[PDB]
Ligand binder design. Sequence first.
Ligand SMILES: [Zn+2]
Ligand SMILES: [Zn+2]
Ligand SMILES: [Zn+2]
Ligand SMILES: [Zn+2]
Ligand SMILES: [Zn+2]
Ligand SMILES: [Zn+2]
Lengths: 108, 108, 76, 76, 148, 148
Amino acid sequence: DQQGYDVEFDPPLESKYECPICLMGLRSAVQTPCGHRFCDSCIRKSIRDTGQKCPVDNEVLLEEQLFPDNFAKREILSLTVKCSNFGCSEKMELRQLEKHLSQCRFAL
Amino acid sequence: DQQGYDVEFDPPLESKYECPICLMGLRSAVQTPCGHRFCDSCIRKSIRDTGQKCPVDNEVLLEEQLFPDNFAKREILSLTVKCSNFGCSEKMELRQLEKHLSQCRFAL
Amino acid sequence: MQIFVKTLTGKTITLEVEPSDTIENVKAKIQDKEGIPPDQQRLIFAGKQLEDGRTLSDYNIQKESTLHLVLRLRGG
Amino acid sequence: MQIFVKTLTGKTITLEVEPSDTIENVKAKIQDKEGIPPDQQRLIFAGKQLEDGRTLSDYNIQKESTLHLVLRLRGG
Amino acid sequence: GLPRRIIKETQRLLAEPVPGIKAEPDESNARYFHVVIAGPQDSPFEGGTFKLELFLPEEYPMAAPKVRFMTKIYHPNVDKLGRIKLDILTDQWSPALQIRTVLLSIQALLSAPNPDDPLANDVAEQWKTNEAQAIETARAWTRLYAMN
Amino acid sequence: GLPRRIIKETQRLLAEPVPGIKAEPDESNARYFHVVIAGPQDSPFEGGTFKLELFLPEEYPMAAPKVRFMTKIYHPNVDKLGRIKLDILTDQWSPALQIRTVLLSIQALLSAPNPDDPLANDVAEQWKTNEAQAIETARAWTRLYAMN
Ligand SMILES: [Zn+2]
Ligand SMILES: [Zn+2]
Ligand SMILES: [Zn+2]
Ligand SMILES: [Zn+2]
Ligand SMILES: [Zn+2]
Ligand SMILES: [Zn+2]
């Protein structure tokens, strides 16, 4: 169910902070032994459905071998983003989005 | 004995790729559970000499809890650097430095 | 307004706050960037240790004023 | 010269090579950036699978020519 | 409301198209794709335009997309119904792979036919026994069925 | 050939100085530092300039630097020989910490004296029993020993 962070980044989201599976910002980032980043849910879905291997190069990858890239997470959460609601022009850090989305004046 | 990568980066080395212990490029980068980067040797020296804790915030840190930030390593090795020898003006990726330093025309 | 915060390593970061913000509020913003819990931080300005209770307007921290970060200070 | 290489995700990277470089040489440079071993890579240009033996000058890959990356292709 | 990978993956593919390959989604169903792969250079199919139909299943990207030719083609790895014997679709798939890469692999398959792992057995037999005949047959099949 | 952290850490500190605190290395020994901390605002030491001597040991940064005052100062956490009762130096050190941060902590210690964890016992006793007297004593000790 849970994918990555879906919002227009400003400047646009760099590929290094992008998930190969959902093509969005890395929600709860995790890094492999071979050494690339995925969301927590997405890579575990690729293991559970598609098989115990790293999507991009077919290297060996168990579910336990993953670890959280908390350095990457702190960087991503501080990136500036635009309000996802139609009409709103305001900007903020990604960490402050969920707070503002309740406070936003344009939501349905 | 072994510290980080000691060379003039161009553009200058960003703090996110810098080791807090040696103040240089992260040689064989490793990330903690609390989530910041060190060299392989430097953090293990801080554990062995100074104690089982993360230098920057005194969080709990065993020697086994570390893991290699191979994503960070690949980024650092592709950063452009200048020749460390006195007089040489040529530039290259960090990965190609050791090869060129034997081939360099200015070394003592 | 902006405020400069010099970290343990020597690197600087810039936060966005108003003078009404507490020192506990600023330490919570420094936690978000660097990943250091607020109780572990000790902030210095003009050679004065800034304590959790007061605000930035009390110590008189203005636009582009440089703070300094120090580790936990307990027993001597 | 420069050459564009479109990765699996859609992101592009730009390498530095000469026409004398082999396909094995270019796959080794793509390993350095992305962390994909050379045997696992399959490069496409003008709808033609580029094999390890030949060079870039044989296939006629010029300045700012866009290659494409594909995963390992074994059995059908 | 479609899965929001597909909505991005459509936009990237449509905004930055691949040279030779046209691709657009069906107006009544975003999971169906009107594909038209042009015939590659220095092959049996030099100067042809072949239709295809690509479908994204329910559990995409964890399941591979189903692709079939919508044009008659004399090729050992493509059967007379249009279904393709390509490795991306019949095993060893990963969610990292995209629509863009599948169409590139199908484009690459036309330049490199492999009778040793066949699907159309009469075509694969023809290719091994008399190769120059089968290439001329495929060149005629291009002119009859795949030029306009 | 010194350890190359110290050579960078000297350059950073010298190029970007701290307001109030002067610091330079000794010309014959790079491990010794001529420090001169200015007295902080709204304290007993308002408008003074105190010398210090900072030394970097062999296994720095894994061992903390040894610091001592080179000026007479009426302070409960500083003894009559000049050695300092500050927490960075007497325990719980980490190699992340630098010379810059040590001098900032010593600067901060002057504005906030703590008799409850003392070193100079006569000064710490004087501070608790008669605080306003001890502050005026320290103000005189600044004027005698620490103004030029
Ligand atoms: Zn994801
Ligand atoms: Zn991998
Ligand atoms: Zn809004
Ligand atoms: Zn280091
Ligand atoms: Zn930490
Ligand atoms: Zn050189």
